[PDB]
Ligand binder design. Sequence first.
Ligand SMILES: C=C1[C@@H](C)[C@H]2[C@H](Cc3ccccc3)NC(=O)[C@]23OC(=O)/C=C\[C@H](O)CCC[C@@H](C)C/C=C/[C@H]3[C@@H]1O
Ligand SMILES: *[C@@H]1O[C@H](CO)[C@@H](O[C@@H]2O[C@H](CO)[C@@H](O)[C@H](O)[C@H]2NC(C)=O)[C@H](O)[C@H]1NC(C)=O
Length: 463
Amino acid sequence: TGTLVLAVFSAVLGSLQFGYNIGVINAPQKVIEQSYNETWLGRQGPEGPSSIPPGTLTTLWALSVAIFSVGGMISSFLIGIISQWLGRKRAMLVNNVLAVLGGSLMGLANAAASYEMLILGRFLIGAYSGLTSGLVPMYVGEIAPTHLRGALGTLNQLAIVIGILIAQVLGLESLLGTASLWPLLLGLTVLPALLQLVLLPFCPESPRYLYIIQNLEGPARKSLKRLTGWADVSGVLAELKDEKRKLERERPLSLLQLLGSRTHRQPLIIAVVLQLSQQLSGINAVFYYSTSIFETAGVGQPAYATIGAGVVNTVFTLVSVLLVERAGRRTLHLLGLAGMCGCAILMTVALLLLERVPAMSYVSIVAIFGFVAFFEIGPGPIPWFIVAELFSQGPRPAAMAVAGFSNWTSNFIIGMGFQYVAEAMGPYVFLLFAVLLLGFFIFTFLRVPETRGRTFDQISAAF
Ligand SMILES: C=C1[C@@H](C)[C@H]2[C@H](Cc3ccccc3)NC(=O)[C@]23OC(=O)/C=C\[C@H](O)CCC[C@@H](C)C/C=C/[C@H]3[C@@H]1O
Ligand SMILES: *[C@@H]1O[C@H](CO)[C@@H](O[C@@H]2O[C@H](CO)[C@@H](O)[C@H](O)[C@H]2NC(C)=O)[C@H](O)[C@H]1NC(C)=O
């Protein structure tokens, strides 16, 4: 079994870096922005304006978080080709090389007196995160024995969320996230990539990719022997043999085929809109600008309350793993969307009514926590399950590629536009999210069937 824990450890490390990179921009903002100002002052000359014009600064710092989503977008198309050509292990190793390059470019921003280097570093780390999000679930679910596949499935979520929380707690003013040690945060996100790069080559290749694609038999037999610790593994090998034959029985569809194929259309629309529901809900607005939101809202020590948001995220992800197994699929999405809309309305009421009673700033805090909480029940995991259960073994690759691309593009939209929207509208930002949620809730209530424990024949015939 040891081989199994080691391999899952490497995959989880990749996922944990994904989480770190998602969450590490919320706390250091007011410091990182300052650096930009300083650098932008140094390149003007004698008659300069003595300050970076606010618009230029807001746009630079918004790019510095949307470029990550651009990296993910470019990933979503590539997840398949490298997986098929190199495999799972080799893809992750090349991926770690790209990760080190991107993070190193991130961390050397201060010395270079350049804000382009950090933007490019975010692009590279975004491509990393896209590929590793694509390639960790595949591998862990690939190797894990039949019974434990469900349990090892959720390790990716715990990993990502713990990574986010670690990033948020390392951005405090007493800890790394300070005036002169912020780039070392980005160096830190470099660091675990080396540990994974030096640990993985001591782990086995996915038997399924070694049998179904490469046609190889003996190496797969050795890998199974060295993974499961069984005297005889004939049954599993035969099962994958018939799996290869079934895959040959119905070859997968190309992306354009899926897009233009009438029969597989309506489920494709459901997948796309559920991803848009996960993202345009506004969760990434919280994960990226919690500190800014709180400081606007009258909180005393915004970084601490952001840590609170991260801890709520972790706790309710644990609850989600322990609950989703016994609740349904549409039901949890509905409940999460409704709770999130209510929490956004409460946030708007708290911001609007802050002047009249300052001691109500605390209310804002709880609202956001509720928000995050109600996101990790309904719209956090459920969209991916619904995407999985709406498609047979044939067209899953293309369907997942489309869902992921839509997810990343909507993430870019929210991450780039939140600053401008908040500046323009003011305390009303969250009202907008509330409206979206309600809108989407309508859709989800009356357009997505319940897929829990429902036969693929029943699912398809329902449409
Ligand atoms: C707020 C977000 C962050 C915080 C996560 C969030 C929590 C989560 C994490 C892991 C699985 C399911 C839910 N819920 C997500 O969906 C999350 O993460 C992923 O989707 C990660 C990997 C997936 O297995 C493959 C798809 C990976 C990408 C194609 C999509 C990534 C989504 C992010 C999301 O931006
Ligand atoms: C951009 O950075 C400069 C330099 O720190 C800021 O200018 C200083 O601002 C203070 C007030 O906060 C003035 O009293 C100082 O005299 C300014 N420095 C100099 C050298 O004149 C500027 O305010 C910053 N602006 C933003 C938006 O960050």
